[PDB]
Design a binder for this molecule. Structure first.
Ligand SMILES: O=N[O-]
Ligand SMILES: O=N[O-]
Ligand SMILES: O=N[O-]
Ligand SMILES: [Cu+2]
Ligand SMILES: [Cu+2]
Ligand SMILES: [Cu+2]
Ligand SMILES: [Cu+2]
Ligand SMILES: [Cu+2]
Ligand SMILES: [Cu+2]
Lengths: 336, 336, 335
């Protein structure tokens, strides 16, 4: 498209919401290509990541870890206003894996505290894609401080299975998985700091072990449980978008499956089916579609079970509805 | 199906066999859906995992690590009687990744020492799938103590390639891969413990390093070598089912290939072909089909070669038959 | 038949050092051939980082990785492998592309002062790892750099999943190496007189499963700066990537993998529109991309600690016209 053609396209302003929720959207595109406008303010802030009060100096798009999910359709333009307030200490930028050119946008969006920028790119490829900050010379430090999220570029006709039949979800959730590398003192207690830069050298030492101290969803151990358990009902179709900007993960719905899984996250690559555990490499997003068939509590985990149940990578679903004894029944309950 | 309909189905009792062997079965289903009955007794038992005499307090379905392979067909019911003898010390349960509801069955099968339970589930999806114990709050400790195996749910019409041509194996082996996390003393020698509980705290410390001390097939370094090497012949079609309940692996047949590999383990997901090294994420099973073409000794490994050759993840095949100089020949033997 | 195999033409090919690739045609020229290559093994000290850190490299053809050999399906690859008398260790070669004798390793064990010639039929199309594998010291040779890859092209060249031809303008081979360099009690990397002197200390590092360095083309920054790979807007590039011991997850920063044979095997349909692909340890993969924007790209293992702390980052320098439709700065960084 020419500059004039793009200038004539309709604009739509979107209001972002905090993960694991996703902002309002339509699965099938409403009308032709649009310039979809988003704004995010970067917040450097302390987050508490476990029940021992361990702290991370988060670098948080829109104030959350992960940053929020942006949803557009293929061949829309995504136009992001990114703001780095004067209250922050570091330069930041943004790299969209969905975008083409200038290091995904990072080369055009380096903003010091007190600066803003507006980047537009054409969403040419359908899928879920990571975005993350990447300041030259400081790239993994910002990413493993939580400065990452994802977008979804839906096909204009919505999702389809590998034989071209529509797949339409009732609910969508976005699970951002984060590896953290928290320094410890000589007695094994996690260290606290009173500015992000003060933690840099100690954190790099831990990073270089390639062994996270914490692996968490939505920024903290237990975050997506209790008050933040995800919900569904028997018969409901749910899309679970999962990202990991730095490190591999292997998602698994305990008690369920991934009926269709775009494990690479790219919708023109046919989905795997009937999955027990899928695999998303560091630096990518993936998506799983499931229809719930049983009520009750489910756990949703990274299925390195040490990562899930020692290091923090476990969420819950609470599902309502009627139990199906054909699918599963206790013929003899635990007894002497 | 209604309760009355399920009650009218034929029952078939199966006698399990120890890995890497697989109990007798038919690739193509014989007759309509059946309730296929299995029994396993859980044994907490000391095992030796290397030639030095290193011990683990294993938690072993049917007394083996891995637990045995159960084989059914799609839309059969798997009915397991699980027994936790009074000689054991811990509560145990079972989660079938093939099943739907109640955390794969774990929520319905929590049995204390001196208890049993019977779980029935409908095997709705074709593939190989992990099963493992998962007591709330103690999940990875049981799994990495060996309390895991796999099942195979064959399509009722047997296996096919991605384009609908039948694939019929001559024999099948089940390789369960186990990551162990054995504590060491200040001399760097592995520790021994009187009861399983005494090892817990020390073992969790090793687990949290995400670095196993041992990575083994069939419960020990070298378990599938010597007189326990797997066997085949030139022309023979072999299915190798491989599981890893906790941690990634990358199987490879040294001197061979995976002609067809269901790397995700799910038979409705078309197999990859001509594979050198395939990838099975922690929490999953996969399956590879190969027709042997050359005689001699092969090694079957996890192709992180440190894991294979330092940590234990290497098996052997002995293969009979005639050497094929078209496929490979030594034109000049090592010489001055 | 025996006479048919003996009657096939034999063709010698001159190798080139990675990341470049020797002369070849994408579509096969003529019928099956026995394609002859020669490599000399070099044991030598290399410096792998900006601090003067040394590895005793074990290098096919003198490079880490060893060079890419290119044949077509149903050709034969006939390698003369030479272990000069100045070396100290026995070596061999395992081709993952080959069938039998542990990929060739069982037939090619050569002591210093020996050579051998191995022929195998390249029956399966794809990119495949090759590596040294002396029994009982396999990972040590591999993680000392003694690995590379081959490409077995389909006789009709590459195609997408719908049978449309994919023809590259250029090809690069990125071999990724995990190194495990011992350190003294003060954290300084150790140096050794002879390769064997480092064996025990190195195995201790290996068993941590944590590399000290993860590099392309044998050193931190080997494919950056003035050694960046190059392309132009509109150019179609195939990037072959291998890792003989350890997983990797390649990513072109600012680009994509338009078609990715992530398993490396061309009869397995390629994934499309990839952000980051995954190659397990012990395998090669290949990605096809048409460049659409000029400028500097990074190409990384997208464990960004591995990329930007441990060494696994390369660059492409791309010429041509910027496309504002694909991306534009609506408002440059400003107050
Ligand atoms: O599926 N239980 O980890
Ligand atoms: O294929 N030898 O690891
Ligand atoms: O795609 N930036 O690592
Ligand atoms: Cu930042
Ligand atoms: Cu990135
Ligand atoms: Cu148990
Ligand atoms: Cu599980
Ligand atoms: Cu060697
Ligand atoms: Cu190998």
């Amino acid at each position: 498209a020419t500059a004039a053609e793009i200038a004539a396209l309709p604009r739509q302003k979107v209001e972002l919401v905090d993960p694991p929720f996703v902002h309002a959207h339509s699965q099938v595109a409403e009308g032709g290509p649009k310039v979809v406008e988003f704004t995010m303010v970067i917040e450097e802030k302390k987050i508490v990541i476990d029940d021992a009060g361990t702290e991370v100096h988060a670098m948080a798009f829109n104030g959350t870890v992960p940053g929020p999910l942006m949803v557009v359709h293929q061949d829309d333009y995504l136009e992001l206003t990114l703001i780095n307030p004067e209250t922050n200490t570091l330069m930041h930028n943004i790299d969209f894996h969905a975008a083409t050119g200038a290091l995904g946008g990072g080369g055009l969006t380096e903003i010091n505290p007190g600066e803003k920028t507006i980047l537009r790119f054409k969403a040419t490829k359908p899928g879920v894609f990571v975005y993350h900050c990447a300041p030259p010379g400081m790239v993994p430090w910002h990413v493993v401080s939580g400065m990452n999220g994802a977008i979804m570029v839906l096909p204009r006709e919505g999702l389809h299975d590998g034989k071209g039949k529509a797949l339409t979800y009732d609910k969508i959730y976005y699970v951002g998985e984060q590896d953290f590398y928290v320094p410890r003192d000589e007695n094994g207690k996690y260290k606290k700091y009173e500015a992000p830069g003060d933690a840099y050298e100690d954190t790099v030492k831990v990073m270089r072990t390639l062994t996270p101290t914490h692996v968490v969803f939505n920024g903290a151990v237990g975050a997506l449980t209790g008050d933040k358990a995800m919900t569904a009902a028997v018969g409901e179709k749910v899309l679970i978008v999962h990202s990991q900007a730095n490190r591999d993960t292997r998602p698994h719905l305990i008690g369920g499956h991934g009926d269709y899984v775009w494990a690479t996250g790219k919708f023109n690559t046919p989905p795997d089916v009937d999955q027990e555990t899928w695999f998303i490499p560091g630096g990518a997003a993936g998506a799983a579609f499931y229809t719930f068939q049983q009520p009750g509590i489910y756990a949703y985990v990274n299925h390195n079970l040490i990562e899930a149940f020692e290091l923090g990578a476990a969420a819950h679903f609470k599902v309502t509805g009627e139990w199906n004894d054909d699918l599963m029944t206790s013929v003899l309950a635990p007894s002497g």
